[PDB]
Amino acid sequence: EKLGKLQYSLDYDFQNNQLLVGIIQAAELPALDMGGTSDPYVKVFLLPDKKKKFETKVHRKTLNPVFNEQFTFKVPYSELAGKTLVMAVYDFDRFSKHDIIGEFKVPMNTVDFGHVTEEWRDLQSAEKEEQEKLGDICFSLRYVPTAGKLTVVILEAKNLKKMDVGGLSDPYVKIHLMQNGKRLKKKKTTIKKNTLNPYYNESFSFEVPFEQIQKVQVVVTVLDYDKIGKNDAIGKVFVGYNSTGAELRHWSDMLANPRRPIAQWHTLQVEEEVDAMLA
């Protein structure tokens, strides 16, 4: 099955005890018949912990993307056995999908370290990818340059994780406007009870002058409401400064289409790893 090639680099840096993964480029990706081209990007992670995933920038309308991106996994050399590098090429669109054009796995036991690995390898078929299920959140972003008004509409969520024993969840979403690690504003949606697919369609606005929009970050977190007890977050995602892949594309599209609300689905990630990226 012809799915194209991926050029990558692999190297263990004994100095800083970290694995270096390079996503150079992909070639000959399958040509769509329902679209024409693809908006490819690569997710990079190490099994068995599909918690931490990295993403390349999403490339527009192409079957031969050149990424030139580097990623890092802090792992002690003596803990490499049992781990597998996964490089999945996704086809972007504003949906929850997970359209895996193809992928390439590299079991650490097949790698000759102490020498730099850099090569092309054919992409293999794959429908589902090892993923931690927390659900998807859907929201729209709209920015009016002149007025300096940022509008975030929390539309809906689906397949949320079950936070209530012998039940579902009581999901609510809160937004955090941030700038340089500093919390500028907070917002919270109403609470929906007993559901994994809440529908909100609640709009919120912020005042972000054009001279700042380029430095802020909008953090969206979905949590479960618990009357008697702590409200545990089920997952989060953020867009704006330093965001990557799909999140960066969402933010960019917003800036490219002033005055228009761009809606898009995002895959929720574990609160801990998203916080490290906002760090």
Binding site for a second copy (CB under 8 A): 7, 9, 11, 13, 15-16, 20, 24-25, 60-62, 64, 66, 68, 70, 115-116, 118, 145-146, 210-211, 214, 252, 255-256, 258
Least distance from C-beta 118 to a second copy, angstroms? 5
Q: Which is nearer to Cl ion, 68 or 194 (CB)?
A: 68
> Hey, CA dihedral for 186, 192, 196, 201, is it positive or negative?
negative
Question: Is 92 annotated in some ligand binding site?
Answer: yes
Residue at 268: amino acid letter = L
Tokens at 19, concatenated: 């694995």
Rounded to whole angstroms, the Cα distance separating 124 from 104 reads 6
Question: Is 122 annotated in some ligand binding site?
Answer: no
Rounded to whole angstroms, the Cα distance separating 199 from 210 reads 31
Least distance from C-beta 61 to Cl ion, angstroms? 6
Measured between its terminal Cα atoms, the distance across the chain in Å is: 42
108 interface partner picked from Cl ion, a second copy, none, CB below 5 to 8 A per type = Cl ion
Rounded to whole angstroms, the Cα distance separating 67 from 25 reads 5
Question: Is 226 annotated in some ligand binding site?
Answer: yes
Rounded to whole angstroms, the Cα distance separating 172 from 234 reads 10
Q: Candidates 101-109, 123-131, 156-164, 165-173 — which segment interacts with Cl ion by CB under 5 A?
A: 101-109
11 interface partner picked from Cl ion, a second copy, none, CB below 5 to 8 A per type = a second copy
Pick from 65, 102, 135, 171 the residue near Cl ion by CB under 5 A: 65
The answer to whether 145 and 258 are in contact (CB under 8 A) is: yes
Pick from 14, 28, 62, 79 the residue near Cl ion by CB under 5 A: 62
> Hey, CA dihedral for 94, 97, 98, 101, is it positive or negative?
negative
Helix (H) and strand (E) counts in the chain: 2, 16
Taking CB under 5 A as the rule, does residue 107 contact Cl ion? yes
Rounded to whole angstroms, the Cα distance separating 220 from 29 reads 33
Question: Is 140 annotated in some ligand binding site?
Answer: no
17 interface partner picked from a second copy, Cl ion, none, CB below 5 to 8 A per type = none
Least distance from C-beta 51 to Cl ion, angstroms? 19
Least distance from C-beta 152 to a second copy, angstroms? 19
The answer to whether 247 and 237 are in contact (CB under 8 A) is: yes
Question: Is 13 annotated in some ligand binding site?
Answer: no
The answer to whether 172 and 220 are in contact (CB under 8 A) is: no
> Hey, CA dihedral for 192, 143, 252, 277, is it positive or negative?
negative
Q: Is 179 helix (H, G, I), strand (E, B) or coil?
A: strand
Q: Which is nearer to Cl ion, 97 or 183 (CB)?
A: 97
Q: Which is nearer to a second copy, 70 or 201 (CB)?
A: 70
9 interface partner picked from Cl ion, a second copy, none, CB below 5 to 8 A per type = a second copy
Binding site for Cl ion (CB under 5 A): 59-60, 62-66, 68, 81, 107-109, 121-122, 255
Per the annotation, where are the binding residues for Ca(2+)?
32-33, 39, 91-93, 96-97, 99, 164, 170, 224, 226, 232
